[PDB]
Every structure is written in structure tokens, then in C-alpha cells.
Amino acid sequence: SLEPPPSTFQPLCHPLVEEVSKEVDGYFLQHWNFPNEKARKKFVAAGFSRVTCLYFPKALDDRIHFACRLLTVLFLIDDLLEYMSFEEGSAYNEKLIPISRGDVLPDRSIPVEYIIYDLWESMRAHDREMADEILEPVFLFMRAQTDRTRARPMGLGGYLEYRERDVGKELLAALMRFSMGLKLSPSELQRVREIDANCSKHLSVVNDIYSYEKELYTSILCTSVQILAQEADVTAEAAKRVLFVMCREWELRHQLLVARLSAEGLETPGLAAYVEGLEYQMSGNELWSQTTLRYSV
Amino acid sequence: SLEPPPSTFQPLCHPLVEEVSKEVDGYFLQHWNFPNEKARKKFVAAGFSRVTCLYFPKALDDRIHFACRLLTVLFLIDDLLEYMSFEEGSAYNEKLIPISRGDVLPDRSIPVEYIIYDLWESMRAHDREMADEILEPVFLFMRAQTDRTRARPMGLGGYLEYRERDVGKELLAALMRFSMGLKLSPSELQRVREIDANCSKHLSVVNDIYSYEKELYTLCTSVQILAQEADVTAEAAKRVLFVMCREWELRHQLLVARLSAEGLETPGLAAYVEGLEYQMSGNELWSQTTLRYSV
Amino acid sequence: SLEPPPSTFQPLCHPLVEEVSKEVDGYFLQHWKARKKVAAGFSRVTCLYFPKALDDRIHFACRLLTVLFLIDDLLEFEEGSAYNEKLIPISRGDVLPDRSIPVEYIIYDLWESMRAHDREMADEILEPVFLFMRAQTDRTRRPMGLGGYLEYRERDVGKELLAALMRFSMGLKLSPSELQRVREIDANCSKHLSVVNDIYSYEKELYLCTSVQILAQEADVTAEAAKRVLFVMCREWELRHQLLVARLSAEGLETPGLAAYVEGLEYQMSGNELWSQTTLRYSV
Amino acid sequence: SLEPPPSTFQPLCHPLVEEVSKEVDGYFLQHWNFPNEKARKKFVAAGFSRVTCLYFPKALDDRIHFACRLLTVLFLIDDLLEYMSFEEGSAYNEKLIPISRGDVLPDRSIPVEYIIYDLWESMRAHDREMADEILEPVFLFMRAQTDRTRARPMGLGGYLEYRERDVGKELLAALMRFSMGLKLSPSELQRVREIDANCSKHLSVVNDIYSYEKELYTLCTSVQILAQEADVTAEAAKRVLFVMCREWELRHQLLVARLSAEGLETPGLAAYVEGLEYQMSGNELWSQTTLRYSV
Ligand SMILES: C/C(=C\CC/C(C)=C/COP(=O)(O)OP(=O)(O)O)CCC=C(CF)CF
Ligand SMILES: C/C(=C\CC/C(C)=C/COP(=O)(O)OP(=O)(O)O)CCC=C(CF)CF
Ligand SMILES: C/C(=C\CC/C(C)=C/COP(=O)(O)OP(=O)(O)O)CCC=C(CF)CF
Ligand SMILES: [Cl-]
Ligand SMILES: [Mg+2]
Ligand SMILES: [Mg+2]
């Protein structure tokens, strides 16, 4: 099989993983309109709350659950969208957006509508200012869930630059800041721009490495594995390995940029905690990619 | 510095290296026109025959000197071109091409001319049939020594496919077939087409990796390219490219076995495919030592 | 030899152009060589870009451009990012301008007058403007092919600054729900503006990143030859724009505000062309 | 539908077109094993010798038939290859090569085998020198008919650079020189490198413009690539590309004038570049009329 190269990074989980998993999972099991029982067992087996704790281990104890709820519903909605058309899904989420802003009261008879309205109302209660900060990142993501992918020849360079702007990863960085109470200033973010780009790249390639077998079932393939294999003319497996070393090079560069950021006296306490959180998203994303059933054939 | 990742390929120097060295080196130490003495000293150190012996280890004991000669003169000529222009250089070699075919005569007063003539007459003398096989390969190559790079940005893929056609690595393969008395038939060579590209690509990247510093002083190299596309330092890029070379090495082996499974292959190809394997490991050792890449 | 191919897009000019031009030019030419020329046609471009702008807002746009144009180039130590960055806080009004340095109180007053006419929409242009100003002062690049460049330009900031400034000029209120519906049309439009720009500014910018150089290399033809091919490509995007607008309408997603928005984008393209040809900024 | 933009070039056919066709047709009509009758009917419809007179309208009267025969057999062999695997076809043509060289006699009982042998035996008999001059161009093509295309992300520039090296266009140019009796020296050919690359792109793109739909059933053409990089329809890409083709026609005229103004144009090159012009004009008409692209 495939062996991951040496890494100075290691996966961690949020301390309250078990308590939150129970809480959040419980809520949805009683509120979410699940199809049959096999579905409820498939939901618990997924442990979305646990996935979230693996991504945001350094999240505040009284905030980690918000993230678990947020991602949980996003994962669920993403599954529903699978059985819908771009027109349907687009309209579906576009409706939940005003409900998320809290500018439209939900139809209490529809689960997803009040779960969303409630989740955001709850969030604004805990921290109005920061809760508003993640509104845009979330919608940007939601709208992207139903966007049509334009196919065009892309070399490794173009592909990687494209992933640097991935909205899913942008959502994770903004959600992580919320779960950690990190209110970074405009100057501080523009200060870690390279770090973010590098990280977003890491997360994506790691996903490509383990999601390849899945996507290669085409019964519109956009992945670094495919691109690196054709450009270097090697097998997909050969490309996966090469891509993995590249990822370690991005971990190194991360440490370099973090050292540079500090050496220049620009590492405020927040950025310190932030760039650390990012290190855990990278290691967390890797363990997840290696186990999640989403990538299972 | 840079630590090369594990390889199952091992270099090998041709046994007669030391003798063919004294021989060939001498031939040029009296015939070729060297400026002063410093030129000669350096020349000795460069050890072109040694370099050749590292690339063609399995070369027939009574043919290894030919190669050492062919590459010593090209290495020599190439060096002179660094002081000539695209018009001057293109003609310089363009003039030597006919004489090489034997269709023209070598002005005996002109070192380089009779050496090339004598060199070839000698080769057709040993093996007329094969001494010709490497006429075009050498020419197509000589003319390439004076071309002007075109203006089009290349990505990793474009650069690699481009290196799969490298005229130089093509010359090597041909000069090796000659040094090993391997008369491959057209149907065979094509059967190893992918094997030639994968190899040429391998030789070029290893070269890039060790020649980066040198070239960097003013660029078409896999190091700068991957460094820009992946957005990492040149060093990080070298490490990645090196691992990539190991994949090409593993691929080579597969291209070799696959060649026999779907129909075992003649001793010629079987031998040739092995010769290619030695150029790869040979080139690596060279790249790590040749002063050509030193500052 | 540059004979623009046929186009169905007809450029419009704001009827108050003459009025506002002298009005606006007469301003900076008081609060700012022996030359100063004008011949550039700043307020003139604005009027070609936003011909449907509201009569009482058209001068605002001319001022924001007459200043942004005197900055993009003109006054611009290849990292004088401190110059621009020192004008953002002022723009928001969080810092007062030294009545001595024109470029300062010009920005201040300018923005203060924009909020006073309409705060909401005035604040909305802030970010789009800063993003433009923050953009390009040198931070660019890796290997760029045609497709990469056009894709890069589909998300151009200046092109984003125009749509922003345009909505403010016409008093067009659009929700992200509606803007999201016109992403394709925006990307397409942004390309048209950038390539036309590249075609006529090739000489000036050459005195680099431009579709003219790239196509010339990839097709291996001269710059002028590339300009002609690029022009035909612009006519295709014009056709695509119409098709996209047709679709927006049929898909029942067209709303009055959106109907005006698209048509306005058409004006920027046609206007951008007429201008680029005449403007002595690229030495006609 | 698709209206071709203005052009200063015009298609031209060879005068002996009617006689050559008759001659070349009858020959194959009796020596070539046509499955039934439906085939012979189709065969005549193709007008292979008529296609040749369109591409080489300036061919010598006593040579144009050599071209028609050559293309006809290649066309036919291309069709039979469609019913063979890569390994099959590769071995099929790999056998006709040693035969074309005249090095191995044909099995007179197998049509394709003795039709090739005799053809080359004939050509050498008319101009041994030039005949051998085009052996490699033909073999380079034949071996490409059974090649596996390596798919990789490719932009416009990459695709065009690749087409400049198209073996088919190389064959037409080589075959054209043979048909026109133009023995170009190495210096002359090197002198028209750009011109050949420019023309090679032109023929290749015009083909793509008209073979798109055909290939658009259930991969590697300038149409799909430009449409995707510019985000326009394939139909629009075709209109843009056509204009580009006129630009290349312009480039051709300017390269000839410069090549002339620099005193580098010879009587042979003059006839050659004009021959390429008609190759571009002819290829365009063919692309619009051949049934090879229909449905
Ligand atoms: C992005 C996250 C939550 C967003 C909610 C959802 C449904 C994310 C899943 O969207 P994608 O995974 O990007 O499409 P994909 O499966 O890759 O073809 C946290 C981690 C999820 C990942 C999914 F890839 C990876 F980090
Ligand atoms: C195929 C030959 C040698 C193989 C060893 C190699 C890779 C020689 C390298 O030839 P170069 O194109 O100049 O790359 P470089 O920047 O000098 O390292 C013949 C020697 C030819 C020369 C001129 F081509 C001498 F450099
Ligand atoms: C270049 C030649 C003729 C010019 C007519 C042309 C442009 C034929 C081109 O047919 P293609 O659509 O390019 O598919 P191909 O890969 O060439 O089989 C002689 C080669 C003979 C053929 C017969 F099979 C090739 F098409
Ligand atoms: Cl030209
Ligand atoms: Mg500018
Ligand atoms: Mg410009």
C-alpha cells in the first residue's frame, strides 16, 4: 500500500470530543428528518462532531460544539444536494441564507430551516461580532456546493494556485478562528496570507491523494494526482508518493514562514495560536483523509 | 546539503578507464591546440574519458576509446562555442559535418578537422555499418549546439516532455549502442520508445538538480519550474525532483519487465535497456562531481 | 494594421460629460510641470463607462477615477505601498488630511461627499476600491499561459471596481443573491475589458503580463497579429454576453435591477473600446 | 454555417489530375484486394489521386503519379489499421519497411507487400537520389500510424508547438519536394525552418476546424483547447482559429520576403515556399470537402 513520509506534525483531537459528539449527535438524531434507521446508524458511524474535533483541537471548550453543529448540518445538506439539480440545490441553500443571517424566520415545521436559524441565533448570542465574521465564508461555501465546474487544461502550477483559493479551506480557517475566539485584525491576516495559501494547498493535495480511487470511477476529474501523473508520465500511485513528499515540503515551509513571522517581531499572540491551529488542520486533515468513509469505494 | 533518496541503480566505471585515459588524453595533448599549459592541466582534471567510462561501462573493450574521442572533441568544441556567435558557431560545426561523413577532406593544418576525419574514418574502419548509424545522431546534435532558445513559457509537463527529446541524451544512447556493438532493428528500438524517453527525462532532471546553482547567475530548468509551480524554494524543489527520478527508475524496471512478459525480448534490447540503466546512475555520479556545475 | 472587427455593442456617453468634465478637471487643476494636458479624457472615460449614471452622481465617479488614474501610473519607489496604504484610512474617514498635501484632502473630501449623498452605497465601494489600490504595486507571479491569464483576468480587481462604482453611480441596489446570479456574465465581461485594454496598451505598457505577449508567443506571430486575433475573441465574448443575458432572462432569474446591471456591463465594454482607441494615454 | 475569413491564397489542382487518377485508380483497382464491390465504389469516390493533385499542384508531370500511388497505399493501409490493435498494426507496417527499402523481396501473393516494393523500386529507378531522400519521412509516418498518444494537460501554445513537429505534414513537405524535383541542401532547409513550422501549424489547425464534429463523437484539437481556455463555444473557437490561420498565411508571406530581402532565398527555396502556400490553400479546400470528416 501507500506509506506516508516522515512528518514533524501530529494529529490531535479536542479534549471534549466524547461529550460534544454525544450532545450534537443527539440533537440531530431527534431533530433531523432521517430516512430510515440504517441512515441513523450511518450518521452516528460518521461522527461529524468527532471530525470537527480532529480539525479544531485547540478550540475553546465552550465553542467547539458550534463548529460541530455548523459542519454537521453542512455535511448533511451536502448529502441532500447530491440528489438535487444545480437549480434545485442553488435555490435550496439560497433560501437558508437569509434564515442564517436571521433576516427570515424559519418554518418550524421544516427541520433544516429552524436548525439553521437556531444555530446562527445561538452563535450571535455567544459572540455577535465574531458570529457575523463567518457569515460570508459560510455562504460563499454554500453557494459553491452547487457551482458548475468549468473544465480547462491545467498544469500542476495552475491547479495548486486554484486550490490556494479553495472556499472549503477558507471556511475552515474562518470557522477555526471563531472556535478559538481569535479576532485577528486586517493587518494580521494580510500578514499570514502566504501561510494560509501554503496550508490550503497542503489540505487539498492530501485530500486528492486519498480521494483519488473514489473519483476515478467516472461511470470532470480535477485532481493533483491525475495532473502530476500525466505531466511526469508515471502511475497515479507514483504521483501520490511524489505529491506526499511535496506536502512535507509545505509543512517545512510552514515552519519557515512561522519562524520568519516571529523573527520580524510580527507574531502577536493571536497569530501564534492561529498558525498553530493551521498546523493541526494539516495533520488532522491527513488522518481524516486516511479514514473517512467519504473516500471509501 | 542535498541527500539523494535511495536507488537500486549502481554506477560502474569501465575497467580500461585508466588506460583509455592515458591514450585518448595523450592524442589530444599533442594534436589539439591548447592555449598555454593551464589549459592542458585543467583538461587532464576534466578527465573526459573517465566521464565517458562512467556513462558507457559495458562498452566493448575495443570501442570505448572511440566514444572517449567523440565526446572529448565535442566537449572541447562546445567550450569554444562559448566565445563564438550563433552565425560563427553554426558554420564551424556545419563545416565539420561533411568531412565527418568523409565526403570532404580535412585541412591537415587544422587540428579539429583531421581529428574529426581521422576519428570517423577510424570508426567506419572498425564498423562501417554502425559508424554510419551514428552520423545523423551526431549531426542533429552538433547543429543543436548553436540554436536559439524560443520564447514560450513552459510548465513542468511541457519541460519534461521537451527533455524526453533532448538531442544530447539521444546522442548518448546511440553512442552507447555503438560502443556495445548492439545493432538494434527498427522494430526493436520502437519497442523501447517509452524506455528512451523516461531515461532521457531522468538524465536531464538529475542534471538540473546539480547544475541549478551554476545556471543561476543571470532559466529553462526543472528546478526553477517546480519551485514556482509548487511555490517552494529551489532546494525543496530539488528534493522533490529527486524522488521523482526514483519513480522514473521504478518505472524503467516496469517498462523492462513488461517488455518480456508480453513477448520476451532479444539479447540486443535486453542489453540496451541495461546500458540505459547505467547511464542514469552514471549521470547521477557525474552530476555530483563534474566541476562543470561548480562555481 | 488594426481594424476592429464588427460589433453589435454600441457605446453611450453621459449627456453631462462636457459639463462634468470641465467641472471635475477644473478641480484637480487647482489642488494639485508646465504640462498637465486632460487630453487623457479621465472624466470622459467615466462618462463612456457609466453613461446611465445618475446625473447627480456622475461627478463622484469622475473624481474617484481622475484620482485613481493619476495614481495607478503617474505618481508611481516600487513599494511606495505606503503612499496608497496611507490613503485608505483617510478614505474611510478615520484619519484627517493635511490641507497641504492635495492627494490627501482630495480623497477625504471626495469620500466625505460620497457618504453625504448616500452612506450605505458609499461604504460599499470602500472595500472594492481598497482592494484595487491594494492590488498591483508589484506582487505577481509563475508560469502563465493563455488560459491561465484569461482565468486570472476573469477575477480582475479594477474590473470589479467598475461594477462597484457603476452600481453606486446608477443608484443600483443589488443583493449578493442577485450578484451571484451574474457571476458568469461578470467573468466574461472582465475578460473583454482586460483584453481590449491589453490590445491598445501594448505599446504603452511595453514602453510583462499581457494577453498580447502571451498569444504572440503561443501562436508564434507578431504582437500586432496577436492583437487582431484577440479582437475577434472579444467579439465572441460579446456574443457570449448576449447569450448569457438571454439565459438569465429565460431561466426566470432576471430582475429589473439585474436587467439594468447587465446592460450597464455592456456599456463598459463598448465604452472601454472607444476610449482605448482615442485616449492619447496609449499614444494614438 | 462557418464562413471562412478572407484569404490571399487560392486552391489549385494539377493539370494531369484526370489522367493520373485514371492510371492510379485502375492500378489499385486490380492489385488491391477490395472486400467486395461496395468498397471499390467507395474507393473511387475518395479520389485519392485527386486529393494529391490538390496538395502538390506544382508537381512535375512525370512524378505526380508517384505521389498519388504513395498516398493511396498509405490511405488504404490507414483504414486497415483501424481494424488492428497497436501491436498488430505496428508489426504489419514494420514488415513493409524492410520491403520498401528494397532489402527484402515481397510475397507476390500478398498485394500490399508487392505494391509497396514495386512502388519504391520504381521511384528509385526514376531518381535514386531523391527517392532515398524520402524513405525516412515515409517510415517516420508509418510507425506513427500505430502510436499510442500520451494524454497530458496541454495549452494552446503546447498543442501548436507539438503540431509543428507533425510527422504527416513533414511527409507532405518531403513528398512535395520529391514531386517538384527540388533537391534542397541542408543549409536551404535550415533556412526555411520557421516557414515550415508556420505552415505545419496552418495545415493542422484548418484540419481541426473541419474534423471537430467528426472527432466529437464518444480529445486533442485546437478547437476544444481554445474553446476551454477562452471559455467560448467550440463554434466560436473555430472562428477565432480561422482568423489565426489567416495570420499564419500573412506570416508566411513576410517570412518569404525577409528570406528574400536577406539574399537567402534561392531558386529552389522560392519554388518550395510557393509549393507550401498551395499546400495550405489546398488542404483548406480538402478539409471542407473530404468525407473523412463528414458525420
Ligand atoms: C470542508 C469541511 C466541511 C465543509 C462541509 C462539506 C460537506 C465539505 C465537503 O465539501 P468537499 O469535501 O470539498 O467536496 P469533496 O468531498 O471534496 O468532493 C471540513 C472538512 C471537509 C472536507 C471535505 F473535503 C475536507 F477538509
Ligand atoms: C551527451 C554528452 C554528454 C552528456 C553529459 C551532459 C548532460 C552534458 C551537458 O551538456 P550541456 O547541454 O551543455 O548541459 P550542461 O549545462 O553543460 O551540464 C556529450 C557532451 C556534449 C557536450 C556538448 F554537448 C559537452 F557538454
Ligand atoms: C498528410 C497526408 C495527407 C493530407 C490529408 C490530411 C490532412 C489528412 C489528415 O487526417 P487526420 O484528420 O489528421 O487523421 P490522421 O492522424 O492524419 O490519420 C498523407 C498521409 C496519409 C493519410 C492517410 F491515412 C493520413 F491522413
Ligand atoms: Cl511574422
Ligand atoms: Mg496601470
Ligand atoms: Mg494595459
Say whether residue C242 is in contact with chain D using an 8 A CB cutoff. no
State yes or no: is C60 an active-site residue. Answer: no
User: Which protein residue has the closest C-alpha to ligand 2 atom 26?
Assistant: B75
Under 8 Å between Cβ of C11 and C270:
yes
Could you say which ligand is closest to the alpha carbon of residue A292? 1
Angle subtended by helix axes D48-55 and D267-289, to nearest 10 = 140
Name the nearest CA neighbour of B245 among B206, B208, B218, B277: B206
- Candidates A87, A94, A161; nearest CB to C177: A94
- Domain ranges, ordered by start, for chain A: 1-297
Give the distance (Å) from ligand 6 centre to CA of residue C202.
Answer: 6
Q: Which of the 8 DSSP states describes residue B121?
A: H
Q: Which residues contact A212 (CB under 8 A, 6 or more apart)?
A: A223, A225, A226, A236, A240
Which residues in chain C are contacts of B228 at CB distance < 8 A?
A: 141-143
Annotated binding site of D for Mg(2+): 78, 207, 211, 215
- Residues 6+ positions from D112 with CB-CB distance below 8 Å: D32, D73, D76, D77, D96
Instruction: Name all chains with 3 or more CB-CB pairs below 8 Å to chain B.
Output: A, C, D
Q: Are C247 and C183 in contact, with CB atoms under 8 Å apart?
A: no
In ligand 2, which atom is closest to the CA atom of B55? 4
CATH of domain C1-284: 1.10.600.10
The catalytic residue positions of D are 55, 75, 141, 169, 286
Nearest residue on chain A to C144, alpha-carbon basis: A158
Domain A1-297 maps to which CATH number in 3.40.50.1860, 1.10.287.890, 3.90.1150.10, 1.10.600.10? Answer: 1.10.600.10
Question: Going by C-beta distance under 8 Å and a sequence separation of 6 or more, which residues neighbour residue A68?
Answer: A20, A21, A24, A48, A49, A52, A53
From B154, A154, A161, A231, select the one nearest C217 (Cα to Cα).
B154
Measured in Å, residue C68 CA sits from the centre of ligand 5 at: 10
Q: How far apart are the first and last CA of chain C?
A: 13
3-state secondary structure string, chain C?
CCCCCCCCCCCCCCCCHHHHHHHHHHHHCCCCCCCCCCCCCHHHHHHHHCCCCCCCCHHHHHHHHHHHHHHHCCCCCCCCHHHHHCCHHHHHCCCCCCCCCHHHHHHHHHHHHHHHHCHHHHHHHHHHHHHHHHCCCCCCCCCCCHHHHHHHHHCCHHHHHHHHHHHHHCCCCCCHHHHHHHHHHHHHHHHHHHHHHHHHCHHHHHCCCCHHHHHHHHHCCCHHHHHHHHHHHHHHHHHHHHHHHHHHHHCCCCCHHHHHHHHHHHHHHHHHHHHHHHCHHHCC
User: Using the beta-carbon criterion (under 8 Å), do A157 and C142 form an inter-chain contact?
Assistant: yes
Q: What are phi and psi of D6, to 5 degrees?
A: -55, 145
Residues of chain B with C-beta less than 8 angstroms from the C-beta of D158: 157-158
Q: Which of C52, C69, C83, C105 is catalytic?
A: C69
What backbone phi and psi angles, to 5 degrees, belong to D10? -135, 140
Residue count (chain B): 295
- Residue B63 carries which DSSP code? T
Q: Which of B268, B212, B265, B262 is nearest to B239 (CA)?
A: B212
Residues 6+ apart with CB under 8 A from A244: A2, A4, A5, A209
- C-alpha span between B131 and B69 (Å, rounded): 13
* Number of Cβ atoms within 10 Å of the Cβ of D123: 21
In chain C, which residues have their Cβ closer than 8 Å to the Cβ of B151?
217
Q: Tell me whether residues B155 and C144 touch, CB distance under 8 A.
A: no
Q: Are A59 and A20 in contact (CB under 8 A)?
A: no
Question: What subunits make at least 3 CB pairs under 8 angstroms with C?
Answer: A, B, D
Question: H-helix or E-strand containing B222?
Answer: helix B222-230
In the stretch 72-111 of chain A, residues with CB closer than 8 A to chain C read 87, 94, 97
Q: Which amino acid is at C220?
A: D
User: Cα(D151) to centroid of ligand 2, in Å?
Assistant: 30
Q: How was this structure determined?
A: X-ray
Instruction: Report the chain B residue with the minimal C-alpha distance to residue A227.
Output: B157
Mutate to test the interface with D, among A148, A152, A162, A231 (most CBs of D within 10 A): A152
Q: How many CB atoms lie within 10 A of CB A271?
A: 21
8 A C-beta contact, residue B179 and residue B63:
yes
Class of the domain covering D1-295: mainly alpha
C150 to chain A: closest CA residue: A152
Residue linked to cell 447569450: C243
Q: Is B229 in contact with A201 (Cβ distance < 8 A)?
A: no
Q: How many degrees, rounded to 5, is the angle at CA C18 between CA C13 and CA C22?
A: 135
Residues C253 and C183: their CA atoms lie apart, in Å, by 13
CA separation for the pair B117, D246 (Å, rounded): 48
Own/partner contacts of B212-219, CB < 8 Å, gap of 24 or more, are B212/B238, B213/B293, B213/B295, B214/B292, B214/B293, B214/B294, B214/B295, B217/B295
Minimal Cβ distance to C143: which of A87, A139, A157: A157
Residue by residue, DSSP assigns chain D as --PPPP-S------TTHHHHHHHHHHHHHHHS--SSSHHHHHHHHH-HHHHHHHH-TT--TTTHHHHHHHHHHHHHHHHHHTTS-HHHHHHHHHHHHHHHTTSS---TTSHHHHHHHHHHHHHHHHHHHHHHHTHHHHHHHHTTTT---------HHHHHHHHHT-HHHHHHHHHHHHHHT----HHHHHHTHHHHHHHHHHHHHHHHHHHHHHH------HHHHHHHHHT--HHHHHHHHHHHHHHHHHHHHHHHHHHHHTT---HHHHHHHHHHHHHHHHHHHHHHH-TTS--
Q: CB of B221 within 8 A of CB of B239?
A: no
B81 lines ligand 2 (CB under 6 A): no
Show Cβ contacts of residue D254 under 8 Å, excluding neighbours closer than 6 positions. Answer: none
Answer whether D90 sits within 8 Å of B190, measured CB to CB: yes
Cβ of B211 closer than 6 Å to ligand 2, yes or no, is: yes
Round to whole Å and give the CA distance between D224 and B189. 34
CA distance A60 to chain C (A): 31
DSSP D81-146: HTTS-HHHHHHHHHHHHHHHTTSS---TTSHHHHHHHHHHHHHHHHHHHHHHHTHHHHHHHHTTTT
Give the CB-side neighbour count of residue A265, counting CA atoms within 13 A: 0
The residues, any chain, with a CB within 8 Å of residue D237's CB and separated by 6 or more, are D222, D223, D224, D225, D226, D227, D230
Is C139 part of the contact surface with chain B (CB cutoff 8 Å)?
Answer: no
User: For residue B172, what is its C-alpha cell?
Assistant: 548518448
What gap in Å lies between CA C84 and CA C107, rounded to an integer? 11
Of D90, D94, D161, the CB nearest to B152: D161
Q: Closest Cα of chain C to D156: distance in Å? A: 6
